[PDB]
Design a protein around this ligand. Structure first.
Ligand SMILES: CN(C)c1cccc2c(S(N)(=O)=O)cccc12
Ligand SMILES: [Hg+2]
Ligand SMILES: [Zn+2]
Length: 255
């Protein structure tokens, strides 16, 4: 599978039937129909003990992996029950600044979208978590083009070393707190992974406030490759899935 004409999102259902399921992501967030829920607790993000280990190009995007062997970087509160460990974060972006995000707000598309993946610790490991309706929690953050995000530069500079599919690089001491917006106000709904296997095990938490990154920073994202070394160059752009039908789901807002 991929994001091309012959293997893109519209073809995924053939190999992964769940693509046409009841709680698929992403979705369009209609701000006017979202239900303000006063019982939603504030988000608790404890990223001070985070330990980043490696950065890798997997052929669809690049991932920054964290040591999830202990409660070092955890997420809790909000609509969540229990503790969720940060295992990795990645992005989705477009070829142009007007597209790239997976979730949209009132049909509005952002330049990119950051996903911080966490798994429910009561399940022992990520692999067991993907077998539960509440096994994962993904924190989604929109990126818009404007001023440079200082905390993103270290990621942007290492991109040269993982240009092609399969390449990885040591990436220690990265602090994800530098990618967070000022406000933790959010929207939440039950969904799925946005890439195959598209499992419906995710509690999505999409932040209302976007972070700004510069044109130069976003440009470097667009210099990565979908292909492996030695193969014809396919620029890794537009690695996002279109919005899926909300179906029988309600989007709740913490505000
Ligand atoms: C398989 N593992 C690593 C995953 C868990 C949860 C979400 C994932 C997403 S996404 N786009 O849904 O956040 C993309 C790729 C892998 C994911
Ligand atoms: Hg599941
Ligand atoms: Zn993602």
């Amino acid at each position: 599978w991929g994001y091309g004409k012959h293997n893109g999102p519209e073809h995924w259902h053939k190999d992964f039937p769940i693509a046409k399921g009841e709680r698929q992501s992403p979705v369009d967030i209609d701000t006017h129909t979202a239900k303000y829920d006063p019982s939603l607790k504030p988000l608790s993000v404890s990223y001070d003990q985070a330990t980043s280990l490696r950065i890798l190009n997997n052929g669809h995007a690049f991932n920054v992996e964290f040591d999830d062997s202990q409660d070092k970087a955890v997420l809790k509160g909000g609509p969540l029950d229990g503790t969720y460990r940060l295992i990795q974060f990645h992005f989705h972006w477009g070829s142009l600044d007007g597209q790239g995000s997976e979730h949209t707000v009132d049909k509005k598309k952002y330049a990119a979208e950051l996903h911080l993946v966490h798994w429910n610790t009561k399940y022992g490991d990520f692999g067991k978590a993907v077998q539960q309706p509440d096994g994962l929690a993904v924190l989604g953050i929109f990126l818009k083009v404007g001023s440079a995000k200082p905390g993103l530069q270290k990621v942007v500079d290492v991109l040269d070393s993982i240009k092609t599919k399969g390449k990885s690089a040591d990436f220690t001491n990265f602090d994800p707190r530098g990618l967070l917006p000022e406000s933790l106000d959010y929207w939440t709904y039950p969904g799925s992974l946005t890439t195959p296997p598209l499992l419906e095990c995710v509690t999505w938490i999409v932040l209302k406030e976007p972070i700004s990154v510069s044109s130069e920073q976003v440009l470097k994202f667009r210099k990565l490759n979908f292909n492996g070394e030695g193969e014809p160059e396919e620029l890794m752009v537009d690695n996002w899935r279109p919005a899926q039908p909300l179906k029988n789901r309600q989007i709740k807002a913490s505000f």
